[PDB]
Write an enzyme that holds these catalytic residues in place. Structure first.
Site, PDB file in Angstrom:
ATOM      1  N   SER A 238      -4.092 -14.501   3.149  1.00 38.08           N
ATOM      2  CA  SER A 238      -5.039 -13.674   2.460  1.00 38.08           C
ATOM      3  C   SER A 238      -5.125 -14.217   1.025  1.00 38.08           C
ATOM      4  CB  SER A 238      -4.540 -12.248   2.488  1.00 38.08           C
ATOM      5  OG  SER A 238      -5.449 -11.367   1.839  1.00 38.08           O
TER       6      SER A 238
ATOM      7  N   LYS B  63       1.224  -7.076   5.627  1.00 37.50           N
ATOM      8  CA  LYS B  63       1.103  -8.230   4.732  1.00 37.50           C
ATOM      9  C   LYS B  63       2.392  -8.347   3.971  1.00 37.50           C
ATOM     10  CE  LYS B  63      -3.870  -7.280   4.013  1.00 37.50           C
ATOM     11  NZ  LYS B  63      -3.876  -5.824   3.990  1.00 37.50           N
TER      12      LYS B  63
ATOM     13  N   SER C 151     -12.486   4.076   4.270  1.00 42.49           N
ATOM     14  CA  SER C 151     -13.046   5.359   3.816  1.00 42.49           C
ATOM     15  C   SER C 151     -12.007   6.410   4.050  1.00 42.49           C
ATOM     16  CB  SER C 151     -14.312   5.738   4.630  1.00 42.49           C
ATOM     17  OG  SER C 151     -14.710   7.045   4.199  1.00 42.49           O
TER      18      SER C 151
ATOM     19  N   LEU D 116     -17.586  -3.412   0.991  1.00 41.03           N
ATOM     20  CA  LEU D 116     -18.502  -2.349   0.572  1.00 41.03           C
ATOM     21  C   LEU D 116     -18.499  -2.297  -0.959  1.00 41.03           C
ATOM     22  CD1 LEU D 116     -17.833   0.593   3.079  1.00 41.03           C
ATOM     23  CD2 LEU D 116     -19.510  -1.257   3.286  1.00 41.03           C
ATOM     24  N   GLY D 117     -17.919  -3.309  -1.609  1.00 41.80           N
ATOM     25  CA  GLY D 117     -17.953  -3.357  -3.085  1.00 41.80           C
ATOM     26  C   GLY D 117     -16.682  -2.901  -3.760  1.00 41.80           C
TER      27      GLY D 117
ATOM     28  N   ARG E 254     -18.027   9.520   6.551  1.00 44.77           N
ATOM     29  CA  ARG E 254     -18.227   8.093   6.391  1.00 44.77           C
ATOM     30  C   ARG E 254     -17.375   7.241   7.356  1.00 44.77           C
ATOM     31  NH1 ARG E 254     -19.035  10.367   1.162  1.00 44.77           N
ATOM     32  NH2 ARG E 254     -16.937  10.023   0.329  1.00 44.77           N
ATOM     33  N   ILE E 255     -16.187   7.720   7.700  1.00 45.03           N
ATOM     34  CA  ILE E 255     -15.394   7.009   8.725  1.00 45.03           C
ATOM     35  C   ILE E 255     -16.173   6.910  10.051  1.00 45.03           C
ATOM     36  CG2 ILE E 255     -13.449   7.243  10.288  1.00 45.03           C
ATOM     37  CD1 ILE E 255     -11.885   8.528   7.796  1.00 45.03           C
ATOM     38  N   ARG E 256     -16.704   8.040  10.486  1.00 43.45           N
ATOM     39  CA  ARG E 256     -17.536   8.084  11.724  1.00 43.45           C
ATOM     40  C   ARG E 256     -18.848   7.303  11.598  1.00 43.45           C
ATOM     41  NH1 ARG E 256     -15.499  11.154  15.324  1.00 43.45           N
ATOM     42  NH2 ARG E 256     -14.172  12.979  14.914  1.00 43.45           N
TER      43      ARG E 256
ATOM     44  N   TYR F 241       0.824  -1.250   0.000  1.00 43.74           N
ATOM     45  CA  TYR F 241       0.000   0.000   0.000  1.00 43.74           C
ATOM     46  C   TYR F 241       0.829   1.257   0.000  1.00 43.74           C
ATOM     47  CZ  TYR F 241      -3.676  -3.401   1.262  1.00 43.74           C
ATOM     48  OH  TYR F 241      -4.480  -4.517   1.284  1.00 43.74           O
TER      49      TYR F 241
END
Ligand SMILES: NC(=O)c1ccc[n+]([C@@H]2O[C@H](COP(=O)([O-])OP(=O)(O)OC[C@H]3O[C@@H](n4cnc5c(N)ncnc54)[C@H](OP(=O)(O)O)[C@@H]3O)[C@@H](O)[C@H]2O)c1
Ligand SMILES: COc1ccc2cc([C@@H](C)C(=O)O)ccc2c1
Length: 303
Positions: A148, A79, A253, A201-202, A258-260, A50
């Site tokens: 994973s 990872k 997010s 979440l897609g 949206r995090i909250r 990442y």
């Protein structure tokens, strides 16, 4: 809430996803991981791939220094990337992730993917990779170790290996109402291995791997109708679905609202009929659908 892993450590059942694509400045990962911890997230999911471990680690160290949390309150995952499967590269790769994060240990270290890449594909005995992971737990570099993107066959290969010392504690895989992994989840439960859901979440629908013609999970009409019935949101329905399945769920997010929002998953419940309706959406749709995975000898979706 937390779940007790098969090695006796505990994992918070809701995790913060930290991946953002390279167009997002690296400084954002610092800001949003602090916001996530202030919101109540205690499990933070990162990876060498990442390119954000410096920032995520600083965000964690920042929240400890200011007194909001203690190190033992945070569950930090990293990872091992697929170019470092050869056993001699495992511990150095983990030690690098630790140096980047400026942490003494990760709570969880995963084999990111069964599909080995040249240190262009590689062939590596993942049992030897696993043996190197066991040594990292023994050394105290990682409290827990897991995998994973493993299918059932690949997971059994580790579980059946001669002289196994530690079972993987989890298998973190793509999992959401369109690809709900029911049979794999049942297998994991049979073996006291936790399933961790990513892209719950897609996904971020990144063009590198996701076809933009694919249906948008959070626009699903059954999820929208359940959101309306519960006066919640489609994202919250999709996260709560996983928790009531006994699946540990990640949520990315980079948006402060949206995090909250996402931590509200603890504040309500779905009924059996709601769960049956979401279970009905399963349609073998994995959003990550790319030549770069599909042509690999060890592609997990071959079975
Ligand atoms: N092990 C692996 O191979 C693997 C692979 C993929 C992902 N992961 C991990 O899993 C994490 C989560 O998966 P993911 O990054 O694919 O994303 P995700 O959790 O499926 O999120 C998809 C999109 O949902 C949006 N979102 C979040 N909360 C929302 C809400 N309450 N309402 C409406 N939209 C909302 C986010 O957009 P905004 O940012 O705009 O809110 C996000 O980009 C990743 O960050 C990474 O940590 C691991
Ligand atoms: C089916 O197998 C895989 C293997 C590795 C993956 C790595 C990512 C990266 C970008 C990630 O961890 O976010 C995504 C999907 C993946 C799917």
């Amino acid at each position: 809430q937390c779940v007790k892993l098969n090695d006796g450590h505990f994992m918070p059942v809701l995790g913060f996803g930290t991946y953002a694509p390279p167009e997002v400045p690296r400084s954002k990962a610092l800001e949003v991981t602090k916001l996530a911890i202030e919101a109540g997230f205690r499990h933070i999911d990162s990876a060498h791939l990442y390119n954000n471990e410096e920032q995520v680690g600083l965000a964690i160290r920042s929240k400890i220094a200011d007194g909001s949390v203690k190190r033992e309150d945070i569950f930090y995952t990293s990872k091992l990337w697929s170019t470092f499967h050869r056993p001699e590269l495992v511990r150095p790769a983990l030690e690098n992730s630790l140096k980047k994060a400026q942490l003494d240990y990760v709570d969880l270290y995963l084999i990111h993917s069964p599909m080995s890449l040249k240190p262009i594909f590689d062939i590596v005995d993942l049992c030897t990779t696993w043996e190197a992971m066991e040594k990292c737990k023994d050394a105290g570099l990682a409290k827990s170790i897991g995998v994973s993107n493993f299918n059932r066959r690949q997971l059994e290969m580790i579980l059946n290996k001669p002289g196994l010392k530690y079972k993987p504690v989890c298998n973190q895989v793509e999992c959401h109402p369109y690809f709900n992994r029911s049979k794999l989840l049942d297998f994991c439960k049979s073996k006291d291995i936790v399933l961790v859901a990513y892209s719950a979440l897609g996904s971020q629908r990144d063009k590198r791997w996701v076809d933009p013609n694919s249906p948008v999970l959070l626009e699903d009409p059954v999820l929208c109708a359940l959101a309306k019935k519960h006066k919640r949101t489609p994202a919250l329905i999709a996260l709560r679905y996983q928790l009531q399945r006994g699946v540990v769920v990640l949520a990315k997010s980079y948006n402060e609202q949206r995090i909250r929002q996402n931590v509200q998953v603890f504040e309500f419940q779905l009924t059996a009929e709601d769960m049956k309706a979401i279970d009905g959406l399963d349609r073998n749709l994995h959003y990550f659908n790319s030549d770069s995975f599909a042509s690999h000898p060890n592609y997990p979706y071959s079975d």
